[PDB]
Amino acid sequence: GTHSHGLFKKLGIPGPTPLPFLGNILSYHKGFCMFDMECHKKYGKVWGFYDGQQPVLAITDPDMIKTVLVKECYSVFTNRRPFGPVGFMKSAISIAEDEEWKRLRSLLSPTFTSGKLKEMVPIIAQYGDVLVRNLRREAETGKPVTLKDVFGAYSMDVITSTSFGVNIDSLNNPQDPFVENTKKLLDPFFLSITVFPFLIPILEVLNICVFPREVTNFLRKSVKRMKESRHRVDFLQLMIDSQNHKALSDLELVAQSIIFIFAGYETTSSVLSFIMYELATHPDVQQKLQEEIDAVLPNKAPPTYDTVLQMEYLDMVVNETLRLFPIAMRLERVCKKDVEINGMFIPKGVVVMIPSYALHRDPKYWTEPEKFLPERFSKKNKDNIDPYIYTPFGSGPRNCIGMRFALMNMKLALIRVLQNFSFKPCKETQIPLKLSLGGLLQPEKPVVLKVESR
Amino acid sequence: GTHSHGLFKKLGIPGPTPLPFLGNILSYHKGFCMFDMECHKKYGKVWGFYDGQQPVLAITDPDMIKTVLVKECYSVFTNRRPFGPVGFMKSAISIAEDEEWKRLRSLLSPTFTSGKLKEMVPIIAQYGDVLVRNLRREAETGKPVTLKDVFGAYSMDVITSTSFGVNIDSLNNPQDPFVENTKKLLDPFFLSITVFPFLIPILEVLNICVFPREVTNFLRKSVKRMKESRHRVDFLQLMIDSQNHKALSDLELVAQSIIFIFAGYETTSSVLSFIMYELATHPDVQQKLQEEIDAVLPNKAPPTYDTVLQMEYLDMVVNETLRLFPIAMRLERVCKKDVEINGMFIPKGVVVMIPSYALHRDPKYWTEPEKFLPERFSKKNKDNIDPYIYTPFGSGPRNCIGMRFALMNMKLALIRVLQNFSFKPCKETQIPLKLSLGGLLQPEKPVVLKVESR
Numbered sequence: 064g065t066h067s068h069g070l071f072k073k074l075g076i077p078g079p080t081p082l083p084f085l086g087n088i089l090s091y092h093k094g095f096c097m098f099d100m101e102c103h104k105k106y107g108k109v110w111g112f113y114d115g116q117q118p119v120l121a122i123t124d125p126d127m128i129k130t131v132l133v134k135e136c137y138s139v140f141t142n143r144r145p146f147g148p149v150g151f152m153k154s155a156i157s158i159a160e161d162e163e164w165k166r167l168r169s170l171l172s173p174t175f176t177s178g179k180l181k182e183m184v185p186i187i188a189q190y191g192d193v194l195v196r197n198l199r200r201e202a203e204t205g206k207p208v209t210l211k212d213v214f215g216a217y218s219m220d221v222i223t224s225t226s227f228g229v230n231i232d233s234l235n236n237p238q239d240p241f242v243e244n245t246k247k248l249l250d251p252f253f254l255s256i257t258v259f260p261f262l263i264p265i266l267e268v269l270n271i272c273v274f275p276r277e278v279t280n281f282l283r284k285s286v287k288r289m290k291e292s293r294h295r296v297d298f299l300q301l302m303i304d305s306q307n308h309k310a311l312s313d314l315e316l317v318a319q320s321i322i323f324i325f326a327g328y329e330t331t332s333s334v335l336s337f338i339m340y341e342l343a344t345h346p347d348v349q350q351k352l353q354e355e356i357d358a359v360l361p362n363k364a365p366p367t368y369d370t371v372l373q374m375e376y377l378d379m380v381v382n383e384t385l386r387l388f389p390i391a392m393r394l395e396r397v398c399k400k401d402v403e404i405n406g407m408f409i410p411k412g413v414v415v416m417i418p419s420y421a422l423h424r425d426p427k428y429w430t431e432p433e434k435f436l437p438e439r440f441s442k443k444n445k446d447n448i449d450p451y452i453y454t455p456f457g458s459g460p461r462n463c464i465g466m467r468f469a470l471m472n473m474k475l476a477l478i479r480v481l482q483n484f485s486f487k488p489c490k491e492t493q494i495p496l497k498l499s500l501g502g503l504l505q506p507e508k509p510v511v512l513k514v515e516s517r
Numbered sequence: 518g519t520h521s522h523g524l525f526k527k528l529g530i531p532g533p534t535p536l537p538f539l540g541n542i543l544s545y546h547k548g549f550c551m552f553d554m555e556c557h558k559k560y561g562k563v564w565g566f567y568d569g570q571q572p573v574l575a576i577t578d579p580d581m582i583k584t585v586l587v588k589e590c591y592s593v594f595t596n597r598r599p600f601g602p603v604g605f606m607k608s609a610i611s612i613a614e615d616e617e618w619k620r621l622r623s624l625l626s627p628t629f630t631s632g633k634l635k636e637m638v639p640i641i642a643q644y645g646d647v648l649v650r651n652l653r654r655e656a657e658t659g660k661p662v663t664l665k666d667v668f669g670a671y672s673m674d675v676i677t678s679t680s681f682g683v684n685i686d687s688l689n690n691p692q693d694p695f696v697e698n699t700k701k702l703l704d705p706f707f708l709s710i711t712v713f714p715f716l717i718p719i720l721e722v723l724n725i726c727v728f729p730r731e732v733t734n735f736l737r738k739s740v741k742r743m744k745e746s747r748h749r750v751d752f753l754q755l756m757i758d759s760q761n762h763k764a765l766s767d768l769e770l771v772a773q774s775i776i777f778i779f780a781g782y783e784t785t786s787s788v789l790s791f792i793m794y795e796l797a798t799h800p801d802v803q804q805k806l807q808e809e810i811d812a813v814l815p816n817k818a819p820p821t822y823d824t825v826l827q828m829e830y831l832d833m834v835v836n837e838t839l840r841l842f843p844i845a846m847r848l849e850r851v852c853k854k855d856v857e858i859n860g861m862f863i864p865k866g867v868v869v870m871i872p873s874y875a876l877h878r879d880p881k882y883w884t885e886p887e888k889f890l891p892e893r894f895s896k897k898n899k900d901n902i903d904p905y906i907y908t909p910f911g912s913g914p915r916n917c918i919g920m921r922f923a924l925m926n927m928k929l930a931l932i933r934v935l936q937n938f939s940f941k942p943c944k945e946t947q948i949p950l951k952l953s954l955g956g957l958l959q960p961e962k963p964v965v966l967k968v969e970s971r
């Protein structure tokens with residue numbers, strides 16, 4: 064009942080009063096983010112609450128954040144909170160724990176170097192052209208456009224060709240066998256889990272594998288097919304070459320490819336939607352970005368790896384968007400052993416949590432946090448931003464391994480789209496933007512905007 | 518179903534074919550010991566089987582046994598198999614794991630030194646006299662005696678005064694408040710657990726604490742009472758003094774005292790019964806032991822610590838009994854990480870098992886294993902006994918911490934009993950002795966013998 068609910072009272076840590084069995088989960092009615100900001104505003108730098116019986120400790124002090132994410136990663140704060148009915152996804156790098164995660168991180172780290180990324184941009188760029196070609200049609204109809212569907216088809220085009228070498232236009236090919244199987248995904252089951260964490264083992268024995276055994280065996284056979292028939296430059300080849308610590312197994316290969324698919328579709332499509340909202344509701348910013356793009360890329364020259372990393376205002380626009388909308392919302396680590404960090408006893412089993420969304424909007428570090436102002440990230444003001452307040456990709460050894468790939472993928476899309484189109488709010492546009500009430504950082508209403516052709 | 522049942526086939530390890538869900542548990546119909554001997558006789562030095570979905574690897578090679586118990590204890594084979602609905606018993610030394618066990622083992626190790634044991638023998642000896650005084654009555658009735666009840670009352674007399682300083686004659690005081698609460702214990706639930714290990718978490722959330730919340734709070738209040746009112750020489754005082762790593766908590770104190778109670782009652786009473794059976798069915802041995810006792814202890818002098826450790830034939834009789842009847846039956850360790858030991862890959866999560874009972878009766882190391890022959894442990898033949906075949910108290914850092922205390926407690930009882938009585942088989946005596954068909958090493962029928970007075 065209230066088994067471990069006396070933990071934060073005994074340590075003298077403040078926080079909302081938990082209910083028996085439920086803990087503080089009813090306080091999620093306003094959203095993960097609004098709960099984090101309220102607890103921040105009403106308790107200060109550190110507070111605690113309970114996801115059911117699971118005690119969660121929020122910290123907002125930069126030095127303590129650095130200690131948890133960097134200084135004591137391998138020793139105390141190595142793993143994230145487990146775990147829904149896992150299946151074979153236990154071998155996924157973002158799921159793996161302790162030395163198995165360390166093994167996977169080192170086997171996959173060379174795959175995300177700038178050298179391998181630079182070799183992926185000619186393929187990624189090919190679907191930027193496909194993107195504008197499908198945008199040209201939906202724009203000439205002369206009526207608002209749902210960016211979630213055009214960026215979604217784009218994001219899937221990129222991940223299918225970067226993960227396996229499958230080159231298909233998703234929007235105009237409604238059902239390639241690969242496209243549909245990848246679209247087979249995916250509340251309130253997620254809150255049932257945190258309040259019934261003891262029922263997770265039962266889902267394993269019931270053969271209730273979270274992923275459909277059809278799509279799972281489809282990818283596992285698609286990969287082993289691909290393995291057989293096989294100078295390719297996709298994530299699969301980069302992982303097959305690393306098989307010739309201890310090399311990756313074939314099932315471990317499927318697990319990582321599944322992760323990248325999940326990693327790319329939700330994030331990049333949603334962040335591209337947030338950027339286009341901000342660009343459309345701040346026309347002066349949209350114009351300055353297009354003027355910069357036309358400068359480095361004359362007469363709509365194709366963007367390359369080197370020309371992308373040269374665009375400073377583009378990087379300022381991406382970073383300021385990722386401040387207002389950090390899609391991960393939270394950072395989490397489990398405390399492996401009793402530790403004292405920066406004058407504070409953290410007992411074993413506690414989940415330490417960094418409220419990224421709340422920190423990106425705290426008036427202590429940001430002037431007028433609610434306004435979209437790219438000038439915060441100019442070279443002049445970039446220096447006074449604490450890299451442990453602003454953590455859109457986490458930090459430390461377990462930060463986002465695909466950060467460079469995601470920034471490069473989104474910028475290549477933004478450049479090609481802004482070279483050809485302008486974006487204005489229409490009447491269906493939700494202004495101001497409201498965030499979804501659920502447990503994901505996405506717009507409450509799908510972003511709809513006017514698209515004109517240059 | 519057969520989720521992990523393909524493990525030993527993939528590694529080329531032999532063993533009985535498992536059934537879906539059940540594994541090899543139906544093969545326990547003859548007993549843990551008969552299953553171990555059959556698998557030993559039918560597979561050689563190493564085999565495997567499944568307790569439900571849990572793979573168990575048996576090993577019988579002495580070098581491999583030394584590597585698992587001693588050489589790689591801290592690194593690979595530190596913990597035992599978990600765990601029924603545990604409750605606060607997670608802080609018990611025999612339940613604790615990894616560094617928490619190491620902490621408890623070092624805090625409790627000084628309590629079991631020979632110095633502290635030597636200070637406990639005047640108290641232990643007091644109830645040896647109480648033992649014969651209750652044996653004198655049940656013998657003068659002139660009819661067979663159930664040793665389980667006289668050794669049981671003796672064993673409880675010893676553990677109550679050694680763990681807390683409570684000095685009561687249990688047999689003639691049917692219900693002292695302490696005696697009854699300790700007697701509140703304790704199939705087929707145990708086999709349900711191994712075939713439904715995923716239902717163990719549900720027993721925790723249902724507040725189904727394995728131990729009655731009445732006796733649990735009784736001891737916890739009995740100890741905290743004892744703590745308050747308090748030159749005493751019991752296990753509690755030795756643990757209270759150690760509170761003045763990090764010192765033991767009050768609830769940790771209750772957890773260890775509960776363990777010693779469980780450790781002493783079942784074992785010592787049952788081993789004393791086995792010894793008296795063997796003494797009664799081998800009168801020549803019983804006479805030679807009494808002749809030795811009368812030599813070192815003239816005219817029935819009281820046994821002391823130094824006079825006990827001087828008796829060689831007594832130690833030979835105890836050791837030969839513990840060979841035929843090793844009450845722990847098995848030794849078990851969980852493999853923490855992938856390891857290679859003595860030319861063999863042991864994957865993570867496997868339970869490595871030493872079949873002590875089967876090794877103590879293997880014709881490879883023992884001539885005529887089924888016969889009770891104390892001469893195997895004479896100084897002449899003691900040298901050629903491998904300390905990893907004969908493991909009545911385990912071995913390595915996690916062996917029986919109370920071995921010296923148990924040997925001293927049983928010998929003090931044997932000496933005082935043999936100074937006064939002789940033991941012959943009666944008609945109710947089960948000859949030959951049969952072992953219980955369940956999952957405990959105890960006689961199938963209670964041992965009943967004739968008792969005469971010297």
Ligand code: HEM
Nearest residue numbers: 157323326327330391455456457458461462463464465469
């Ligand atoms: C806008 C896009 C993205 C954002 C904002 C983002 C952000 C994040 C964040 C905040 C974390 C947690 C880091 C931590 O806990 O400290 C993370 C982890 C991770 N991300 Fe991303 N991510 C993005 C896209 C991607 C992509 C495209 C990939 C791969 C193709 C990827 C792969 C991963 C992996 C594997 C991890 C876990 C690494 C580990 O546990 O060792 N992410 N990401």
Ligand code: HEM
Nearest residue numbers: 611777780781784845909910911912915916917918919923
């Ligand atoms: C005839 C009597 C006894 C026998 C044959 C016996 C045998 C054993 C065996 C075989 C083990 C397992 C060792 C291993 O896994 O390697 C063990 C463990 C243990 N025994 Fe005993 N035992 C006896 C009595 C006692 C008594 C009287 C106590 C305490 C008062 C005790 C306390 C313990 C503890 C605490 C452990 C676990 C130690 C740890 O996990 O670190 N035992 N015993």
